Amino acid sequence: MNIFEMLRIDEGLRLKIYKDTEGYYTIGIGHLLTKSPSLNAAKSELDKAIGRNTNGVITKDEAEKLFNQDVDAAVRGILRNAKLKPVYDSLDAVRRAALINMVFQMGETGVAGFTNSLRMLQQKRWDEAAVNLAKSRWYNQTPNRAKRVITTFRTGTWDAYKNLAAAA
C-alpha cells in the first residue's frame, strides 16, 4: 500500500462531475473544482484544469493526471508549512501517508490548525493523538474515513486499509 492507493480507496474515482460530501463540485479522485453552486462555474474550472472542452466528462488518464498533481501539491504544501514540516519529518513512512491524506482532504491550513494533535504526533503519543484527532468536525462529518486515518496514526500500519474497495 502507498499514498496513492490509500487515497484512491478514500476518494473513489468518478469520471463525471459529482458533488462531494460537503456538496461541492468535484471530479476524478477527489479533485475539488469549485465551491460555487454553479455547475457552469464547475465546468469552466474543469475545462481550464484539463486543457480541453470537456462537457463535464473526463477520461481515466485525465483523472489520474489530476490525481498525481494533487498528491504532489499536498506534499509540497506540507514541506512549505512551518507547522507541518517538522511533524512530517518526525514521522515514519506509514504515518507520513496519513498526514498527506488529511492535507489532501482539508488543505494545509485546515490541518495546520490541529495544533494539539500535531504536537502529540510529533511527541509520538499515538493514543493521545488519536483521541484528540477524534474531537473534530472532521471526525463527526466523515467518521469512517476519519477512523481509517486515525487508526493509521495510532498503529503505524496499513491495517485499516487492508480489506477495502479501490484496491485494498
Indicate the fold that domain 1-168 takes in CATH: Lysozyme (1.10.530)
Q: Burial, 48: exposed, middle or buried (Cβ in 10 Å; 0-12, 13-18, 19+)? A: exposed
Experimental method: X-ray
The span from the CA of 96 to the CA of 92, in Å, is: 6
Closest CA to 67 of 5, 22, 25: 5
Buried b (16+ CB within 10 A) or exposed e, 11-24: beebeebeebeeee
| φ and ψ at residue 13, rounded to 5 degrees | -140, 120
The span from the CA of 112 to the CA of 124, in Å, is: 17
Task: Please list the active-site residues.
Answer: 11, 20
Residue 4 assigned as binding residue? no
Residue 163 assigned as binding residue? no
The span from the CA of 73 to the CA of 25, in Å, is: 19
Closest CA to 147 of 39, 32, 58, 159: 159
Coil, helix or strand for 19?
strand
Residue 133 assigned as binding residue? no
Strands of 25-28's sheet, edge to edge? 14-19, 25-28, 31-34
Coil, helix or strand for 135?
coil
| φ and ψ at residue 55, rounded to 5 degrees | 65, 30
Closest CA to 99 of 138, 167, 161, 152: 152
Record the cell numbers describing residue 13, joined without a space.
474515482
Residue 104 assigned as binding residue? yes
**Resolution of the model in angstroms:** 1.8
